[PDB]
Design an enzyme around this catalytic site. Structure first.
Site, PDB file in Angstrom:
ATOM      1  CG  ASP A 135      -2.143   0.990   1.050  1.00 42.29           C
ATOM      2  OD1 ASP A 135      -2.428   1.430  -0.080  1.00 42.29           O
ATOM      3  OD2 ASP A 135      -2.806   1.284   2.074  1.00 42.29           O
ATOM      4  CG  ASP A 189      -9.649 -11.471   2.782  1.00 38.04           C
ATOM      5  OD1 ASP A 189     -10.827 -11.449   3.192  1.00 38.04           O
ATOM      6  OD2 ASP A 189      -9.324 -12.123   1.762  1.00 38.04           O
TER       7      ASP A 189
END
Ligand SMILES: Nc1ncnc2c1ncn2[C@@H]1O[C@H](COP(=O)(O)OP(=O)(O)NP(=O)(O)O)[C@@H](O)[C@H]1O
Ligand SMILES: Nc1ncnc2c1ncn2[C@@H]1O[C@H](COP(=O)(O)OP(=O)(O)NP(=O)(O)O)[C@@H](O)[C@H]1O
Ligand SMILES: O=C(NC[C@H](O)CO)c1ccncc1Nc1ccc(I)cc1F
Ligand SMILES: [Mg+2]
Ligand SMILES: [Mg+2]
Lengths: 274, 310
Positions: free
Chosen positions: B149, B176
Site C-alpha cells: 500500500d 482481506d
C-alpha cells in the site's frame, strides 16, 4: 404532502455506524426510529427539490418486507427517519454471528426478500444498494429491506446535473454498474444481480471472491467480465433448482437476467418440492 | 545505521518499555489527526506513561475469530524497529473497534504536506525516495513482508527530518477484511495487481513512482494533465483502473525536472513488472546518488511549509 420533521421532535441518541451514504443514530420520535445523517449536509436547492420528490414516493410504500420510510428533516442537518429494527441484519447473521439456519429457513429468507423486491419493482423503485447489510431479520422471522431508493442523496450534485460516483460496497454491484458507462447503470436487473449475490451468501455462508483480497482487483476484473463468483462454494445440501436460479441472476449481460416476478415464482415452486 | 539514528532507535525502545498493557481507559483524547475510507486517527495521551502516541481506530464488522487473529498478526509490529518504519506501541480491540497505537509524527502524512505545499521540490522528493526505498528494503529482508500500500498518505514525516513508512501489510486478515470496503476514488495499484497478484517488491515500486509524480506535479496523475493544464505549472474509478492497465504509464513534464529524476520515475512506472526497476537498481540510480549527496534541510522545509517555527 410536505413530509418534513422539525427540530426538537427527534431525540437523537447513540451513534450506531456509518455506511455508503450516511451515519446512523438511534433516535426517538413517537417510538424508536432510525436517524441516518446524510453525507450531503449542504444540499443545493436543485438537489433539495429532487430529494423531496423522491421522499414522496418512498413515503407511499407499505409492505410487510419493506422498512417503513417515515420522512426526513433538515434542521440540524439533512437526515432520514425510518423504522428502527431490533435484531441483527442478515449480514450480521451470516458473517459475524454465524447463525446456523436450516435450508428451509434459508430458503424462506430468500423468498421474503424476493417478495419485497417484487413490490418495490412493482412500484418502479430501484433499490440501488441491495445487500445483506440492508436486510434485517425482524424478531428472527420476517425479512425487512431498507436503504432502498434515494438516488439523489447518493452522488454529489454539480449544480443541476448528477453523476453517480460509484459508491456502496462493490461485492453486490453488477458489472455494468461497476463500469458506470451505460447511461443508466442502475436498473431492475442490477438489483437482480445484487439479489443473486445475496443468494450466494445464503447458499455458501461466505462472501464472494473469498480468495481475492484486493479491492481494486475485484473492481477491474468484475467490470471487465474476467471475475465471477465461484459457484463451487455452494453447500452440498443446497437444492439444484436453487443453484440454477442463483446463476441466472448473476449473468454478466444484464439483459439475460430474470425479473423478480419470475424469480419469486421459482423460489415458491422449489419451496414446495422440498 | 549511523549514530543519530542508533540514538533515536534506542531512545524509542526505552519509552516503549514504560508502556505495558494497553487499555482504553488509559487514554485521553487530544485532537483528531486524520481520517480515511476505513479509519480515524487521534493524537492521544497515555496516562500510565505520559507518552503521546497516535491511535488509529478501525471499526470493522467481522466475526470474532477473524478479529482475534488480526490482533495476533499485528503483534509482529513489535519486531519492526527501523528509522524508516513508524514506531509501534501496541494494538488491541475494545468497544467494537481495532486500535493500532503508533508513535506520533508531527509533520503528518506527505498527502497532507502536499496540500499545504501545492507541489513538492525535486531536491526534497530526492530525500523522500531514499527513505521509501530503504524502508521497503528493511521490510523485504529483515521480515520478508511487502508493503502492498505505498501512497503519499502512508509516508509520514516529522519535525526531526525523519521520513518513515507505515500502513504496510503485516496482517493479511486485516487486508482481506478491508477488501469488503466501499470503493475509493483513486488507486495506486500496479497494473499486474489489478490483473493478478503481488509480484514481489516490484509492484510496490510502481506505487512509489505514482506517488512521486503526484507529489511532483501536485495532482493525481491519472489521466495525465491536459496540454494547457500542464503549462499552468472527474474520471470514474473503473476507468482509472482500465487506464492504468491498458494505457501508457504517466510521466513527468519534460522541461521542469532534471533528466535523472525523469528517468528514475520512468524506470519505476514500466508496465511490465519484470522490466521494472528493483530495489537494487534504484538504490544506485543516478537520481538517488545525486540526491543522497545533496545536503537538503528537510526539517526546515517541512516546518516552513506547515507554518511552524524553525
Ligand atoms: N433502520 C435501521 N435500524 C437499525 N439499525 C440500522 C438501521 N439502518 C441501519 N442500521 C445499522 O446501522 C449501521 C450502519 O448502517 P448503514 O449506514 O445503512 O450501513 P450499511 O447498511 O452497512 N451500508 P449502506 O446501507 O448501503 O449504507 C449498521 O450496523 C446497520 O445494521
Ligand atoms: N502516526 C500518525 N501520525 C500522524 N498522522 C497520522 C498517523 N497515522 C495516520 N495519520 C493521519 O491520519 C490520516 C488518515 O488515516 P489513514 O487511515 O492512513 O487514512 P488514509 O491513509 O489517508 N486513506 P485510506 O488508506 O484509503 O483509509 C492520514 O492522512 C494521516 O494524515
Ligand atoms: O492499517 C492498515 N491498512 C489500512 C487501514 O485501513 C488503515 O488505514 C494495516 C493493514 C495491515 N497491516 C497493518 C496495517 N496497519 C499498520 C501497519 C503498520 C503500522 I507501524 C501501523 C499500522 F497502522
Ligand atoms: Mg443498511
Ligand atoms: Mg493508510
Amino acid at each position: 404532502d410536505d413530509w418534513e420533521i422539525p427540530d426538537g421532535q427527534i431525540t437523537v441518541g447513540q451513534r450506531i455506524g456509518s455506511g455508503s451514504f450516511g451515519t446512523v443514530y438511534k433516535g426517538k420520535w413517537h417510538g424508536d426510529v432510525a436517524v441516518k445523517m446524510l453525507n450531503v449536509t449542504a444540499p443545493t436547492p436543485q438537489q433539495l427539490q429532487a430529494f423531496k420528490n423522491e421522499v414522496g414516493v418512498l413515503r407511499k410504500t407499505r409492505h410487510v418486507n419493506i422498512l417503513l420510510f417515515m420522512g426526513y428533516s433538515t434542521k440540524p442537518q439533512l437526515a432520514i427517519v425510518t423504522q428502527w429494527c431490533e435484531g441483527s441484519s442478515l449480514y450480521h447473521h451470516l458473517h459475524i454471528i454465524e447463525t446456523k439456519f436450516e435450508m428451509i429457513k434459508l430458503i424462506d429468507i430468500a423468498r421474503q426478500t424476493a417478495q419485497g423486491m417484487d413490490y418495490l419493482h412493482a412500484k418502479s423503485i430501484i433499490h440501488r444498494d441491495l445487500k445483506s447489510n440492508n436486510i434485517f431479520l425482524h424478531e428472527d422471522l420476517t425479512v425487512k429491506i431498507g436503504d432502498f431508493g434515494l438516488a439523489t442523496v447518493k452522488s454529489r450534485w454539480s449544480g443541476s446535473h448528477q453523476f453517480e460516483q460509484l459508491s456502496g460496497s462493490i461485492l453486490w454491484m453488477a458489472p455494468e454498474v461497476i463500469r458506470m458507462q451505460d447511461k443508466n447503470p442502475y436498473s431492475f436487473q442490477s438489483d437482480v444481480y445484487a439479489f443473486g449475490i445475496v443468494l450466494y451468501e445464503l447458499m455458501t455462508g461466505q462472501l464472494p471472491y473469498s480468495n481475492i483480497n484486493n479491492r481494486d482487483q475485484i473492481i477491474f476484473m468484475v467490470g471487465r467480465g474476467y471475475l465471477s463468483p465461484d459457484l463451487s462454494k455452494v453447500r452440498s445440501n443446497c437444492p439444484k433448482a436453487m443453484k440454477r436460479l442463483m446463476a441466472e441472476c448473476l449473468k454478466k449481460k444484464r439483459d439475460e437476467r430474470p425479473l423478480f416476478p419470475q424469480i419469486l415464482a421459482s423460489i415458491e415452486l422449489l419451496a414446495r418440492s422440498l | 545505521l549511523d549514530e543519530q539514528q542508533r540514538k533515536r532507535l534506542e531512545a524509542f525502545l526505552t519509552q516503549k518499555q514504560k508502556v505495558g498493557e494497553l487499555k482504553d481507559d488509559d487514554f485521553e483524547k487530544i485532537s483528531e489527526l486524520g481520517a480515511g475510507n476505513g479509519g480515524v486517527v487521534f493524537k492521544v495521551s497515555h496516562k500510565p506513561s505520559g507518552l503521546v502516541m497516535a491511535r488509529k481506530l478501525i471499526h470493522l464488522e467481522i466475526k470474532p475469530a477473524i478479529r482475534n487473529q488480526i490482533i495476533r498478526e499485528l503483534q509482529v509490529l513489535h519486531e519492526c524497529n527501523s528509522p524508516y518504519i513508524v514506531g509501534f506501541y501496541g494494538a488491541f480491540y475494545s468497544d467494537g473497534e481495532i486500535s493500532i497505537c503508533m508513535e506520533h509524527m508531527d509533520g503528518g502524512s506527505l498527502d497532507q504536506v502536499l496540500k499545504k505545499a501545492g507541489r513538492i521540490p525535486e531536491q526534497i522528493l530526492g530525500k523522500v525516495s531514499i527513505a521509501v526505498i530503504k524502508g521497503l528494503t528493511y521490510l523485504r529482508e529483515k521480515h520478508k513482508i511487502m508493503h502492498r500500500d505505498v501512497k503519499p498518505s502512508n509516508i509520514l514525516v516529522n519535525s526531526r527530518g525523519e521520513i518513515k513508512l507505515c500502513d504496510f501489510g503485516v496482517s493479511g486478515q486485516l487486508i482481506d477484511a478491508m477488501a469488503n470496503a466501499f470503493v475509493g476514488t483513486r488507486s495506486y495499484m500496479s497494473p499486474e495487481r489489478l490483473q493478478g497478484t503481488h509480484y514481489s517488491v516490484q509492484s510496490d515500486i510502481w506505487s512509489m513512482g505514482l506517488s512521486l509524480v503526484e507529489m511532483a506535479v501536485g495532482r493525481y496523475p491519472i489521466p495525465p494533465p491536459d496540454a494547457k493544464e500542464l503549462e499552468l505549472m472527474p474520471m470514474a474509478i473503473f476507468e482509472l483502473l482500465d487506464y492504468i492497465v491498458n494505457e501508457p504509464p504517466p510521466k513527468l513534464p519534460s522541461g521542469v525536472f532534471s533528466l535523472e529524476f525523469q528517468d528514475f520515475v520512468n524506470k519505476c512506472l514500466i508496465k511490465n513488472p519484470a522490466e521494472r526497476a528493483d530495489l537494487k537498481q534504484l538504490m544506485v540510480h543516478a537520481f538517488i546518488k545525486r540526491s543522497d549527496a545533496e545536503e537538503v534541510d528537510f526539517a526546515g522545509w517541512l516546518c516552513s511549509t506547515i507554518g511552524l517555527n524553525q
